Design a protein around this ligand. Structure first.
Ligand SMILES: C[C@@H]1C[C@H](C)CN(c2ccc(C(=O)Nc3ccccc3C(=O)O)cc2Oc2ccccc2)C1
Ligand SMILES: C[C@@H]1C[C@H](C)CN(c2ccc(C(=O)Nc3ccccc3C(=O)O)cc2Oc2ccccc2)C1
Lengths: 320, 320
């Protein structure tokens, strides 16, 4: 048994629900326009929780659902770009919160590709035969990284976390993968810059630290490069469902045409969550499993496709 | 060929050299006292470079040394807790800087255990058979995370980066490993907190963001837990050299006694670098290889042991 397998899914978002109506007041825009530009109706925003707290509940819920003991966890991987501290890692805060004393843990930084990247990691870890049980969680609190006056980005993001319980299976589930990156375009999407202000620094680098994005640029990138990445693993005839990063539904609309894969196969759920970055795919996954669209153990050929800052992007082809 | 192997080593530190004499003036302490408390005589501090720049030179040097093409790199892993941005990752900035268009990349957050953790990752990646050539670099610019007035921590850290070229070998090199963590003590060593100041935040969390450490606490932790972790892989009779995280030489003095492993086997090099966090082990490694203490391809049984914020710690047993 050295084949990684997603046994359980689970998600957790802040209770505070922020509708477009509240954002139209905060800012000076119309809820109607916020809705048509984003494809979002409402989103959750933390009021007292930080990334680790959201990830903590996900882990806690995964443990209760599966009936697993925190002591049976061998490793905890968290995909995030909005961690409480640089040190400790969010994965370590969760490891301590749930008491997974026998698990080692760390965070992975790959922007909105983070969950897919982390999932690829867990597969490698389990393949080695050294580890069998892990928790892979994607979580963010981007609401603390936004300029809530600029209505061309703030209205786009939601907070939340979701993950899965991974355990060693007898038969393969993770069939193929293709992880990629292009740092030659890293300026297209950035956040979290830290100014060096030691008495030794001589540069004049300044950066608000709030998210910055070249919409058209990354939109075009997704359509061209993600489409090619997806087509390197499947074709319409060999895939049942595709769970892409929930950045913008129109990206999905166009990718389905580009790749010639049936549009109803691409699941989406931005309406109530907005763009939850690394958490987008596992939140979508938990919902699709929860309502019976996706069925664990059914052998449905599913592709998970993330893409984001880096630039980063990658897909995983699995049989649920 | 699916056995990870360290083929090349390389290091890079800022040219700006800061001696204890300059720090005694800056602060109001004696160089003599800074020396006896830290075991450091001088350290490098960035004046214009950021973590990615240091890691960039390491990658660039590794590529030139080995004669490899940036296009032959399959993956780039960077261990850091002081990245330029949360997004993009430092690994992505390096991937773009050196033109490793065929490599996917991401950063790993495991504090001063980061390099060991990243190395464990690369081993898993190569084991899978999907990837053969990678660059694993540990780099930090902690000088931007310190309060240069508090002489109980600032005098401790240096800037720098170092890494290795990893490629698929025919015979095993990575013999064993034991990665661990304890998030129940994460408050003992923290840095980089990000305050949430969205119009929705109701908490009153505040944190300077500069490094905070409970010296005695983590010192005791290292002596007890790292000693046990090391003894789970070797005994004096089965190890030739041990490269531990360069946090404090006295930790090594005591660990050698605790574990009963010959003291001359633990290599150290804080004098000219200070504590370079994640970069400490690969800098030490490159130096020991450079001067002939350690010999690649000689089959010397070597243990790499990192420990740091998280809490995190772990060792790798290899035959060079
Ligand atoms: C609030 C604004 C409203 C506008 C209409 C859409 N915005 C946009 C929202 C999302 C994207 C986009 O491509 N996003 C992404 C692409 C790759 C990886 C990650 C993302 C991410 O949003 O996290 C791009 C946007 O801007 C354009 C889309 C098409 C053509 C030109 C720009 C969000
Ligand atoms: C500048 C100060 C000078 C004092 C004398 C030593 N400081 C200290 C320097 C380092 C440590 C220490 O244990 N460090 C660590 C332990 C585990 C993982 C990482 C570190 C790290 O420094 O990065 C602890 C220190 O403080 C004590 C050591 C022994 C007993 C009580 C406190 C640094």
């Amino acid at each position: 048994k050295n084949y990684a397998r997603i046994s359980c899914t689970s998600r957790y978002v802040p209770e505070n629900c922020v509708t477009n109506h509240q954002l139209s007041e905060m800012m000076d825009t119309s809820a109607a326009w916020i809705h048509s530009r984003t494809g979002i109706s409402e989103r959750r925003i933390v009021t007292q929780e930080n990334t680790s707290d959201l990830c903590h509940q996900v882990a806690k819920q995964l443990l209760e659902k599966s009936g697993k003991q925190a002591s049976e966890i061998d490793f905890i991987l968290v995909a995030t770009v909005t961690p409480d501290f640089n040190m400790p890692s969010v994965a370590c805060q969760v490891q301590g919160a749930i008491g997974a004393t026998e698990a080692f843990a760390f965070d992975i930084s790959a922007a909105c590709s983070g969950f897919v990247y982390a999932l690829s990691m867990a597969e490698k870890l389990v393949l080695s035969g050294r580890y069998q049980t892990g928790l892979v969680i994607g979580g963010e609190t981007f609401s603390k990284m936004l300029d809530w006056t600029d209505r061309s980005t703030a209205v786009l993001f939601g907070d939340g976390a979701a993950g899965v319980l991974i355990e060693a299976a007898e038969t393969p589930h993770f069939l193929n993968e293709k992880l990629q990156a292009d740092g030659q375009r890293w300026t297209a999407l950035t956040s979290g810059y830290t100014i060096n202000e030691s008495p030794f620094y001589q540069g004049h680098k300044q950066a608000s630290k709030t998210l910055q994005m070249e919409g058209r640029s990354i939109f075009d990138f997704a359509i061209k490069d993600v489409s090619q990445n997806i087509l390197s693993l499947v074709t319409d005839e060999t895939v049942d469902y595709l769970l892409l990063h929930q950045a913008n539904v129109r990206i999905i609309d166009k990718i389905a045409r580009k790749t010639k894969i049936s549009r109803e196969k691409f699941l989406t759920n931005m309406d109530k969550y907005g763009n939850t970055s690394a958490a987008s795919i596992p939140i979508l996954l938990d919902e699709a499993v929860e309502n019976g669209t996706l069925i664990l153990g059914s052998q449905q050929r599913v592709v998970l496709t993330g893409f984001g800052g880096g630039l980063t992007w990658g897909s995983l082809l699995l049989t649920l």
